[PDB]
Every structure is written in C-alpha cells, then in structure tokens.
Write a protein that binds this DNA or RNA. Structure first.
Lengths: 306, 474, 114
DNA sequence: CTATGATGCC
DNA sequence: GGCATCATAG
DNA sequence: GCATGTATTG
DNA sequence: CAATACATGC
C-alpha cells in the first residue's frame, strides 16, 4: 500500500486493487522486469502507472494525462498495456468519472479505428482474452507450452483473488442499462439522469449522418467551402448550448466526443469548446484538463520516458 | 393565391399552367405512413393545360417523401373531360374520397391522406432604418431559408403548408400528448404516431419511423412546427406592393406599422444598452462575442394602452430570434403558444419567454460566421409577483394564484444590488453571480428565466443591431 | 427495328439515332417459366431536327401489354444519352454495349431480338 | 408505385 | 354488371 | 476503395 | 420496373 499512494497522487486518479495485485503477480513471475514479464512471451508491455511501479519515471516536465495516451484514447480511457506498435494495439482501464473505479478494461488499435472493444472488467480478463485469441492466431504448437504455463498461473491467481474471467461481467451488463449512447466509440456515456429524464437529450442528427457530415466537411476543397459547409456544426452547437442551459449536459458531452473520434485538426477547437465545458458542467474537471492538454498536444508517439 | 406549376415537369414548366376553377384547383398532395408496417410515401397529382396549345395532361409523381421519385405525364390532346375523369378516379382510388367534393375530406386507415399547400424615387427614410428594413425585408434570403428548410434540414421536403394544416398538425400533437401521458406503448400509440407522421412530412431514409416516446421529442416537434408557422407568416408579410412606392420597402415598413428610430451612439440610452449587452454576456457562451453596431427605438401601435402599468417589478428583458422572422414580430408583437399546442412540451407552460442575460436569449439568434448579423430585442415586461420554481413542472400556470409571472430559479444570475434604471424601468446589470439557490433533491436550473402570460404585459422598446463575432475554429 | 407507335408522346416528330452496328434502338425479351417471368423492354434514342436535342425512351412490361414507360430527356448532350443507354444496357444484361455482338445469356437478364 | 389482373363480393 | 380487397409482377 | 448483389419501397 | 441504400467481398 505504501507504494500505491504515490502512484495515485501522480495521476490524480484512483486505481483498482486488481492493478496492484497484477503487479505483484508479474513481480513473482519475473522480479527483474515485472512489467515486461509477458513481453518475451506475448509481446505485450505493462506501462502507465506500472511505469511508476517500475520506478522507470526516475530518469527525469512530466504530463501523465498524455503518457501513452494514444490518438483516439478518450479522456475516460487510461492506457495500461501496450501490444503491437504497428497497429498501436493497447488495453486500458475505462473510467467514466475521476472519482470512480474503472468499469472494465477496453482495447483499441489507434492506427486502425476509433472503436474501444470491451475486454473484461479487470486486467486478468483482458490478458486472458488476448492470450486465448492469440493461441489460435499463433501458427505453431511447440511454442505454446510457455503460454499454457503462464495462462495456468493467470487462472490460479484469478481464482485465488475471486475475480470472474468472463469477457463481459455482471457489472458491465448493469452499466450497459445505464449506458445512454455509444457515441462512435462504442463504450457508452454515463450521465446524471433524474426522475424527470433531465440530464440528456439526443443529437439532432443520426450517427451515420453525423459521420457523413464529418466526411463532407473534412473533405471540402477550400476553407470557404468548409465555412459554407460548416452550417450544420454551428446549428448543432447552438442546440447544444440550448441543451446545456436546461441541464442536458451529456448532449454537449457526446457531440465533442464524436469530433474527438473523427480525428481531424479542423475540429480541435470546437471540441475544445464543447468537451471541456461539458466535463466542467458535469463536475469532471480532471477530464477537462486531460482533453485540453491532449487537444493541444495530440501526438502519435506518447511514451513520456521515450 | 398565386398558383405555381411544379418546376420538375421541364417539358411543361414554361408552356403550361395548373388548372383552376374558382375554389377548386386541380392540384393535390397525398401522404401516407404506417410505422407498424413501415410505410412512408407521398403522391403528388397535378392537372396541367398548356398555355400555347389546347392540350391537357395529368402529371403524377410518387416516392418516398424527400427522395424524388417515379413520374408519369399523360397527354390528352385537349380531352379535358377524360383527363378530369382519370384525375378524380385516381384521387378516389388513393384516398377513398371523391375529388370534386374535396371540401369534405375524410381519411381512412391504410390509404393516403390529403394535405393542403400554398400552390420619381425620393426614398425618404433614415439610412440606418433603410439598411435594417432591406436586411429583414430581403425576399431572396427568405426564399433561400425556405429552400434550406427542405434540402438542408429535411423538415418540409415536399414544400410549404397552410396555417390550417399546421393547426391540424397541432391537433395530432395533442392526441400524441394525451396518448403519451399514460405511458402506454401499444397499438393506439403507434396509430397516433402514424397520424402525426401523416400530417407533417418527415424523411427517415429507411430506418422504421421511431415512436415518439419522451417529452424532448415532443418539444422538438413543437419547435419545428413553430418554425413552419414562422416561415408562413414571414412570407405572408413580405408581400410586395405597387402604387408608386418609389421604395417598396416603405410600404413594407407601413406593414411593420411600428416606428423604428435611429439612435445616436453617444446618447445615454445607446451607451447604457451597450453596457447591459456586455455586462450580461454569460461566461459559458464564450465561443463568440457580440458587438452593438446600432440601436433603434421601438414604438409599436396599440401596445401603450395594453401595458399593465399598474403592476410592479418592471424590467427590461431580452428576446432573440433568427434575422428573418423579426418582420413578423414588429408587425404583430409577441404571441402566446397556440391553444391547440400540447401543454407538456413547455416544461413551465405556455406564454412569452424572456431572459435578463443577453447571451442566453442571444443563443436563439442562430447567427453564423458567414452571416454575422443578428438582432436582439429588448422589451419592458411587468413581471409583477413571480412564482418561484425549483424543478420542472409543466403545470406552473395553475400555481399562479394571484401572481402574474413565473420565475425559473437558475444557478447563475445577477443580484438586484447592481440594478440600475432606464426611463423608470429596472435594468438588471450583471455580472452573474451565485444566488444561493440549490436543490438537495434533484437538479438545479442553470440560469433564471422569466415567463409572462398576459400578452398585454410586454412593451417592446428598443431593437438592437448586433454583430456576432466568432473566433478561431481549429 | 421500328420506332414504337405506342410512344404517343414521341411518335411523328423525330428520327431514332443509330450508328451501323451500334443501333440505339432495341427490344429485349426475357422469358423464364420457372418464375413466370415474361417481360420485354424497348429502348429508343430520338433526335430533334433543329438542335442537338435528344430523348431516351424506355418501355417495359409483360409481353404484349404496354405496362410502364419512362422518358429521360437529354437536350443537354447526345453523349449523356449514350451514357444512359449503354450503362442501362449493362445494368440490365451484364453485357457491354460495345461488346453487344458477343451476347451470352446469363440467367435472369435480358436477351435481345435477333 | 403502374398496372393489369384476379377472385370474390355487392 | 360493376367494383373492389388483393397479387403479384414488373 | 471499387463496383454490385440484394433487400425494400414506391 | 425505378430507385436508394447497405452490406459485399478482393
């Protein structure tokens, strides 16, 4: 516990206990380099707060909101494991608010798409799912025994700690009932909703039509053509103002997120006007900080120890 | 009124006219929808006789509303009798109603329903009012906005509507409100939704038309219908006039029937209004600024006698709207929502809505980067005793019991300590500050707003010409 | 390969365009007793005398009966008319118009009248 | 949807 | 006979 | 990224 | 049939 508080003080976020227990698990597997204990076997790397666990942050300006923050990792998303650097495959805890625990572990390929795929509710589940999926992907049999042994250790540790190993747990299916919309990232929004349905309202445009709007705007051949084409974004932003004035904050939360998912620099400012404010209105100030810093410095290489 | 021919009939748009006989104009649009079986289709029919040569034709065109479709042109070489017969027969087949007595129309289930359509210069005026009128009286811009109301935002794909068609739409929204009020999502709700989507043409692409299930969609539909009515009144008002005007806008100005006088920038009134504009820019609407370019004095006939001067608590409050519809207000003043409109769309009831924070009302102007000119109107409103509301309750109007207006208690708002006076009316200067109203049970309204019910309690006083200045975009 | 008299909206006042092999007038038939398909489709390009002002006629239905028809006007340019004609022929037959000579009846697509 | 055609109804 | 619920075909 | 097989509606 | 769109593999 004595090495936990410095970790969580650095991130301004609380980390669940499975994170630290998995640290101890990997330490027992390989005391010399626990973070990379699965790197020789799986090609995966423990990073982020594990970097603090490894003491590798002691080489040093250190901005942890960007540490391994991939191009499409939403502020809700805290990268914890890296895989293929060609596709920027990675796994991370997903937190809807800075005061809550992660709801599950998601995976994304930042060079492939913006979709975050649920991968269990804890890192044991995430690594087991990746391991099992690769076991069939691996075109060999001799080089599998090591994976069987490490997987055996994974299963026994999860059983001893009382963790379910399902890809989708009970708590995730409960959150999904609280999930109000997928918002191009597929992970769902959690916003306050009172007994009069106050707190959220849907966008004036469908998701497919929103993606079409983004395509037609980003592909405009001149800035004058964009300004003429910009009319639907301006309209949607005015209605977003209307909604926030009536406490339906999540709408302004969602629209910016879609632009965050779209990825074009032409939308960096407008999202910076929508997403931070929405987080401020939602009292998620840390996410406003994260989105400000990421939009100002959204890079394709993000290991702060380089 | 003026009877236009469908332009899509290129072979006959310039050589032919729609047929008319007194009341009966042989032109008709039918709509059908059934979300149970996911039908959403239109059918237009028009009898056209050529202008030059004596030859009649029936034009039919059909498809999904919004998406242009299959058409047919049947020529008759002047066989007007046969052509009229065919017209009436098809009208009956598709509607189960006879065409000639179109007056008594009765839609039947599983058949198309009808709808109703609209088918020596000494220009003496101040130059500033001239610019204002030309800005608001620009017919081109009204046409362009109407075309945008069909091909930009598909709210009225096929065309326009009549006042009475809108009223029937409101009737259907009332039936929807009644249905939804009991939370029953079975068959009657689906039929009521069918009636709504029949009366007001929508385009859903292919995705089954969804059920209207919550209050938010009700209110959005209500605002759409309101915008339809606004466009209708704007085109009615912009009717051009002859008789030696030498500046037709002067007759348009008479149609405003509202004195609008230019104010000097150095006058106390102009400076104070600028102070009020600037001091009350909410901090959470920071994507743009606003500059006061010019300010006009308002004198609307008949309002003076109506003002509730006896009532206390008189303040100057904002009212924003798009550049184009202002022509209607200056001619007719602000109106309460229509009687037939569903009450449950307005979380605190019907009436006239005002803010005291410039940017909150200003959000209703929809100004743009390309089109940077918007207007905000200031009106003196005698609120009298306000009824205090913490949480949404659409039934606020019954709770008045002697009060004259409702106040929705927002988190951020000016405090009366900073209030000043203008011509004996209270001017609520900002900045906004915390008001110590909070809710230990539910949400908290972001900002106050004040609503009045008697139309006689509003007196428009100045019209503000405002440059909305947007900023960097990436 | 006569101009259809049944096209009352166009008979009398124009001459169908062709070019040797490439005859932009044709009637296609498809019979298929398994599915009780028996349908025809005529296509005809017509030129104005005064100006280069063309029209594409399509007519289709169950054999013998006029069924339905469509007039797509191409006063703009005859090349547009060739585009519509040839593209539609490919869509409807899976055979190109330039290669129409080597026709191979694929199932469920039109063949022409020899 | 055109559009004929069909049975079955009145 | 005549019209219409209905087919299905295109 | 390209064209289109297919299902769906007028 | 038109006609539009949505999954459809190389």
């Amino acid at each position: 516990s004595d090495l936990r508080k410095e970790v969580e003080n650095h991130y301004k976020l609380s980390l669940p206990e499975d994170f630290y227990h998995f640290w101890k698990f990997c330490e027992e597997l390989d005391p010399e380099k626990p973070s990379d204990s699965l790197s020789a076997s799986l090609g995966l790397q423990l990073v982020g707060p594990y970097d603090i666990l490894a003491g590798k942050h002691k080489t040093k300006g250190l901005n942890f909101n960007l540490h391994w923050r991939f191009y499409y990792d939403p502020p809700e998303f805290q990268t914890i494991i890296i895989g293929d650097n060609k596709t920027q495959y990675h796994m991370g805890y997903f937190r809807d608010s800075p005061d809550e625990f992660p709801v599950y572990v998601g995976i994304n390929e930042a060079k492939k798409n913006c979709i975050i795929v649920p991968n269990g509710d804890n890192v044991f589940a995430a690594v087991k799912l990746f391991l099992t999926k690769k076991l069939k992907e691996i075109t060999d049999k001799k080089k599998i025994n090591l994976l069987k042994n490490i997987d055996e250790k994974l299963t026994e540790a999860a059983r001893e700690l009382g963790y379910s190993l399902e890809q989708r747990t009970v708590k995730m299916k409960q959150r999904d009932k609280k999930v109000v919309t997928k918002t191009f990232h597929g992970a769902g929004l959690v916003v306050p909703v009172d007994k009069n349905d106050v707190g959220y309202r849907e966008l004036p445009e469908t998701d497919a039509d929103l993606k079409r709007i983004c395509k037609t705007i980003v592909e405009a051949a001149s800035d004058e053509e964009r300004l003429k084409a910009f009319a639907p974004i301006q309209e949607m932003m005015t209605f977003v103002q209307f909604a926030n004035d009536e406490c339906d904050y999540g709408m302004g939360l969602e629209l910016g997120m879609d632009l965050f998912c779209y990825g074009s620099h032409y939308f960096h400012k407008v999202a910076g006007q929508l997403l931070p404010l929405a987080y401020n209105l939602l009292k998620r100030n840390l996410f406003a900080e994260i989105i400000e810093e990421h939009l100002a410095n959204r890079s394709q290489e993000n290991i702060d120890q380089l | 009124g003026k009877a236009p021919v469908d332009p899509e009939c290129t072979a006959k748009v310039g050589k032919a006219h729609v047929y008319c006989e007194g009341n009966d104009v042989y032109d008709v649009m039918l709509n059908q929808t059934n979300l149970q079986f996911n039908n959403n289709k239109y059918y237009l029919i028009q009898l056209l006789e050529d202008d030059a040569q004596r030859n009649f034709s029936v034009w039919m065109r059909w498809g999904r509303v919004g998406k242009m479709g299959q058409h047919s042109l049947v020529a008759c070489s002047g066989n007007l009798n046969k052509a009229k017969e065919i017209f009436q027969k098809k009208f009956l087949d598709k509607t189960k109603n006879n065409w000639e007595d179109r007056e008594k129309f009765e839609k039947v289930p599983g058949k198309y329903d009808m709808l109703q359509m609209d088918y020596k210069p000494e220009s003496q005026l101040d130059l500033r009012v001239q610019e204002l009128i030309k800005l608001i009286c620009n017919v081109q811009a009204m046409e362009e906005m109407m075309m945008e109301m069909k091909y930009n935002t598909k709210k009225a794909p096929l065309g326009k509507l009549t006042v009475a068609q809108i009223k029937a739409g409101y009737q259907s929204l009332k039936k929807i409100e009644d249905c939804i009020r009991a939370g029953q999502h079975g068959r009657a709700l689906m039929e009521a939704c069918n009636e709504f989507y029949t009366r007001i043409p929508h385009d859903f692409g292919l995705r089954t038309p969804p059920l209207i299930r919550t209050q938010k969609e009700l209110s959005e539909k209500i605002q759409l219908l309101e915008a339809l009515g606004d466009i209708e009144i704007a085109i009615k008002l912009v009717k051009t006039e002859l008789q030696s005007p030498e500046h037709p806008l002067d007759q348009h100005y008479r149609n405003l029937h509202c004195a609008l006088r230019p104010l000097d920038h150095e006058s106390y009134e102009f400076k104070v209004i600028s102070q009020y504009l600037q001091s009350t820019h909410a901090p959470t609407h920071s994507d743009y600024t606003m500059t006061l370019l010019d300010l006009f004095e308002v004198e609307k006939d008949g309002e003076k006698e109506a003002f509730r001067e006896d009532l206390h608590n008189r303040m100057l409050l904002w009212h924003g709207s798009r550049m184009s519809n202002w022509v209607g207000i200056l001619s007719h003043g602000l109106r309460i929502a229509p009687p037939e409109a569903p009450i449950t769309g307005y979380m605190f009831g019907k009436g006239i809505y005002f803010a005291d924070m410039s940017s909150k009302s200003a959000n209703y102007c929809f100004a743009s980067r390309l089109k940077n000119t918007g207007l905000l109107l200031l009106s003196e409103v005698a609120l009298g005793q306000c009824n205090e509301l913490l949480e949404a309750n659409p039934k606020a109007e019954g709770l008045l019991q002697g009060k004259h207006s409702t106040k929705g208690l927002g988190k951020m708002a000016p405090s009366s300590a900073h209030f000043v006076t203008l011509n004996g009316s209270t001017v609520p200067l900002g900045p906004a500050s915390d008001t110590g109203i909070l809710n230990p049970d539910g949400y908290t309204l972001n900002y106050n707003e004040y609503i009045v019910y008697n139309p006689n309690q509003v007196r428009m006083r100045y019209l503000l010409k405002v440059q909305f200045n947007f900023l960097q975009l990436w | 390969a006569p101009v259809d008299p049944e096209c009352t909206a166009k008979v009398g006042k124009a001459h169908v365009y062709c070019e040797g092999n490439d005859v932009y007038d044709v009637m296609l038939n498809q019979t298929n007793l398994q599915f009780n398909n028996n349908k025809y489709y005529l296509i005809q390009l017509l030129e104005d005398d005064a100006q280069r002002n063309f029209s594409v006629w399509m007519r289709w239905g169950r054999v013998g009966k006029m069924g339905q028809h469509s007039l797509v006007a191409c006063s703009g340019n005859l090349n547009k008319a060739k585009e519509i004609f040839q593209k539609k022929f490919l869509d409807k037959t899976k055979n190109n118009w330039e290669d129409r000579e080597k026709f191979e009846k694929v199932p469920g697509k039109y063949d022409m009248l020899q």
